[PDB]
Symmetry: none
Subunit: 54 residues, 3 copies
Amino acid sequence: MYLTLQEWNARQRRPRSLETVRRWVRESRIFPPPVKDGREYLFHESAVKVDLNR
Amino acid sequence: MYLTLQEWNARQRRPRSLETVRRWVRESRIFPPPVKDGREYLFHESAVKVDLN
Amino acid sequence: MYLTLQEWNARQRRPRSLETVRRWVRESRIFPPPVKDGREYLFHESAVKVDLNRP
DNA sequence: ATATGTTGTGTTTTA
DNA sequence: CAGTATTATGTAGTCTGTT
DNA sequence: TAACAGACTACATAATACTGTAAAACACAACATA
């Protein structure tokens, strides 16, 4: 199933501002990369911001 | 699901300065280890300070 | 079955206004394109909104 | 006899 | 965050063709 | 017919694109002392 940008952001470790999450998408930080259905982004529910630590 | 560094520090017996708690993370003295999320660390609620060796 | 516009629209991930969906049909964005039966459009069950540009 | 707190500089990420 | 700009969708009104 | 689907035309709104600014959170270093 697919989420809105809002719905996806609400379900993360820590939700950020929508404006930030959009910048993430513009910057190809999210995989799979969402697709703009009309005027709004759809994330697949499996979609994640990619990262680095341990 | 997690706590921020502040949120975690606030529930410890002795809260310390932010630097000190960061030092601990740097030196792997928190288990389980926190995950970095953007610009801040997120702790497991139950993470403890641990000194090995 | 073939679906009405309304029924088609209702099965999509993000249902829109009927007017929007009609604008799509006029622009050929639905594949396969709907047929015309009397007054109304009727859609293939697997019909999907597609993007006919290649940016 | 060392962990902690304070002050300062700089980078990255967020709002 | 605030601010300006871009574009698809949303809404509303009128009109056209069909049953 | 009266009712309805839809075509069209105009405008309003929402989600985003982009730019610019401030600051949060942290890494690192130096130093002070309880």
